[PDB]
Paper text:
To elucidate the full structural architecture of galectin-4, we solved the crystal structures of galectin-4N and galectin-4C at 1.48 Å and 1.78 Å resolution, respectively. The final models for galectin-4N and galectin-4C are comprised of residues 5 to 152 and 184 to 323, respectively and share the same structural features previously described by Bum-Erdene and co-workers. The carbohydrate-binding site is located in a shallow pocket composed of residues present in the S4/S4′, S5/S5′ and S6/S6′ strands and the S5/S5′ adjacent loop. The residues involved are His63/236, Asn65/238, Arg67/240, Asn77/249, Trp84/256, Glu87/259 and Arg89/Lys261 in the galectin-4N/galectin-4C structures, respectively. Structural analysis of both galectin-4N and galectin-4C domains, which share a root mean square deviation (RMSD) of 1.2 Å between Cα atoms, reveal a large difference in charge distribution when the electrostatic potential surface is calculated at the physiological pH 7.4. The galectin-4C surface charge distribution is mostly positive, whereas, the galectin-4N surface displays a more heterogeneous distribution with a positive region localized in the binding site. Arg45 in the S3 strand from galectin-4N has been identified as the main residue to interact with a cholesterol sulphate ligand and to contribute weakly to lactose-3′-sulfate interaction. Reference curves resulted in sigmoidal profiles with respective Tm values of 55.92 ± 0.05 °C for galectin-4, 56.8 ± 0.1 °C for galectin-4 N and 68.12 ± 0.05 °C for galectin-4C. In contrast, the larger RMSD values observed during simulation reveal that galectin-4N can be more plastic, a characteristic that allows this domain to be more promiscuous in carbohydrate recognition and binding, as well as more potent in achieving a biological response.
Galectins are a family of glycan-binding proteins characterized by their affinity for β-galactosides and the presence of one or more structurally conserved carbohydrate recognition domains (CRDs). The tandem-repeat subtype of galectins contains two distinct CRDs (galectin-4N at the N-terminus and galectin-4C at the C-terminus) connected in a single polypeptide chain by a linker region. Galectin-4 belongs to the tandem-repeat category of galectins, together with galectins -6, -8, -9 and -12. Galectin-4 is composed of 323 amino acids residues, which can be divided into an N-terminal domain (aa 1–150; galectin-4N), linker-peptide (aa 151–178) and C-terminal domain (aa 179–323; galectin-4C)19.
Author numbering: 5 to 152
Write the structure that this text describes.
């Protein structure tokens, strides 16, 4: 079922749902979860459409092979762009987290546990984004959309 502006508790992964009202400036996405002890995969995508192969305006991808880092990128016309990386890891083994994306005119502002983490500049117009996709072997307590 499509989300509204009330929290969705214990969503099942993989999660792939339409953003209520489409994506607009001022909107925030709140994700409460726990980064599992044996978590190997985790990503959040702001997607243009619901079909496989759809463009991804913003791919947010904590990575753990070798040195831990968070990767940020865009998939457009079947092509991945130049990767951005932040060489630090704000998620901790087995630890609860609050992950927030605030959609501003210039960038997605990413805040983790109340601490500003990154600002991903828009590459595709943010208004093209229609769906939120989340997957990984972690446990989500809730996903919540706050309208702008
Ligand atoms: Ca590692």
């Amino acid at each position: 079922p499509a989300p509204g502006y009330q929290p969705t508790y214990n969503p099942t992964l993989p999660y792939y749902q339409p953003i209520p009202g489409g994506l607009n400036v001022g909107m925030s996405v709140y994700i409460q979860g726990v980064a599992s002890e044996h978590m190997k995969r985790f990503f959040v995508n702001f997607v243009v459409g619901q079909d496989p192969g759809s463009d991804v305006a913003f791919h947010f991808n904590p990575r753990f092979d070798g040195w831990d880092k968070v990767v940020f990128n865009t998939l457009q016309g079947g092509k991945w762009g130049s990767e951005e990386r932040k060489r630090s890891m704000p998620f901790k083994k087995g630890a609860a987290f609050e992950l927030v994306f605030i959609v501003l005119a210039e960038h997605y502002k990413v805040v983790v546990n109340g601490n500003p983490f990154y600002e991903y500049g828009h590459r595709l117009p943010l208004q093209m984004v229609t769906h939120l996709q989340v997957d990984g072997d972690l446990q989500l307590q809730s996903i919540n959309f706050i309208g702008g």
